[PDB]
Paper text:
Arabidopsis thaliana RidA (AtRidA) is targeted to chloroplasts. By converting the reactive enamine/imines to harmless 2-oxoacids, RidA preempts damage to BCAT3 and ensures that the isoleucine biosynthesis can proceed. In this study, we determined the crystal structures of apo-AtRidA and its complex with pyruvate, and analyzed its structural basis for ligand recognition. The RidA domain retains the basic overall fold, and also preserves the homotrimeric structure with the characteristic interfacial clefts.
The current crystal structure was produced by the construct starting from S68 (named AtRidA-S68), and it diffracted to a resolution of 2.0 Å. In the final model, residues S80-L187, as well as 85 water molecules are resolved. Each asymmetric unit contains a single monomer, with a Matthew’s coefficient of 1.85 and an estimated solvent content of 33.7%. The model shows a mixed β-sheet packed against two long α-helices. In the β-sheet, the strands are antiparallel except for the outermost strand β4, which is parallel to β3. An extended loop L91-E110 is located between β2 and α1. AtRidA-S68 crystal structure is disordered in the first 12 residues, which accounts for the missing strand. The space group of apo-AtRidA is H3 and through symmetry operation, a homotrimer can be generated. There is a central cavity in the barrel-like trimeric structure, whose height is ~31 Å. The buried surface between the neighboring monomers is 1306.2 Å2.
Residue numbers in the entry:
A (entry chain A), B (entry chain A), C (entry chain A): 80 to 187
The structure:
C-alpha cells in the first residue's frame, strides 16, 4: 500500500517522481522528480486525512548528494520551517533508477 | 534488542538472513536470505505479540537492486496485498556482507 | 526541526558529529564523530523530555562499514543492553561528507 494508518499515525511508502496515473517518471531530472515526489506525497497524505503540516518525520534518499541544494530548495517550499524531522543520505541506487525517493510519517 | 514495544507499536531491528540459533547466513544467495529474513521477522513479531498482518511499515535494504524481482516475489508471499507501507533501496554495503536487510514497524 | 514530538513519541532528525554551536565537525575521524553524534542526540532527546533510556529505535548510517567495531563500541556506552531496536548499513555518502549519521525515535 502507499500508506497505512495506525491510528494516531500514517506511514507512507517511499515515493518516486512518477506521474501517478502512468507510472513513468515526470522527467529524468532530479529537479522535476523532487517536485513530483512532493506533489505525490501531498496527495497521499490528504487522501489519508493528513497533510504536509501534519508530517513529523521524513527521509530523503538521493542518487547523488550533489543534488542537495536543488532538492532542499524545492522541499523547503512544501515543508517550510519549522519543518518535519528529517534524514538525508545518498544511496547506491533507487528503484527504476530514480533520482530521489522520500518516505514519511505523519499524524492524523 | 531485536524488538522494542512502545505500546501500541513494536519496532524491529533490521533483520539479516541468518539462522537465528547459529548466526551464520542460511546461504550466500539473496533468494534464501530474503526468505530467511522474512521467517526470522515472523518469529520476532509473533514473540512480540504482533504478526505479519499487523506490520504497518517496512524498509528493504538491498546489496543489489538487480535482485528486486526475486526479493519482491518472496516478500509478496509473506506480505500479500494490501501490504505494509514500504521503502526499497540499494545501499553501499550491509552488515556481514548480507544481501538483504529488512526492518519494520508493527501494531500490537 | 531537530525533533518533532507526536505526543507519546519523539522523532529525531539524522544527527551528524558537529559541534552544535559552530556547525563544524568535531574532527575528521569516525571515532570522534560517532561520540559527538551520541552526545548531540542526548541533548536533543533531553530537551525534548526524552532520554537515551527512552529511545526505542535507531538507524546508523555509515560511510564505511569497516568502522563498525569502533562505532559499536562507542554506541554501546550510550546504549547499553538491552538497547534500542537498531538498523545499520553503509550508504554511498552522507551530508557534508560525514562519517556517520544516526536518527532515532523515542518515547516521552
Amino acid at each position: 500500500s502507499q500508506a497505512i494508518k495506525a491510528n494516531n499515525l500514517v506511514f507512507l511508502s517511499g515515493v518516486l517522481g512518477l506521474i501517478p496515473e502512468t507510472g513513468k517518471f515526470v522527467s529524468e531530472s532530479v529537479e522535476d522528480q523532487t517536485e513530483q515526489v512532493l506533489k505525490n506525497m501531498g496527495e497521499i497524505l490528504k487522501a489519508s486525512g493528513a497533510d504536509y503540516s501534519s508530517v513529523v518525520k521524513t527521509t530523503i534518499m538521493l542518487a547523488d548528494l550533489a543534488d542537495f541544494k536543488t532538492v532542499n530548495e524545492i522541499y523547503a517550499k512544501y515543508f517550510p520551517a519549522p519543518s518535519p524531522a528529517r534524514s538525508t543520505y545518498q544511496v547506491a541506487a533507487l528503484p527504476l533508477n530514480a533520482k530521489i525517493e522520500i518516505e514519511c510519517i505523519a499524524t492524523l
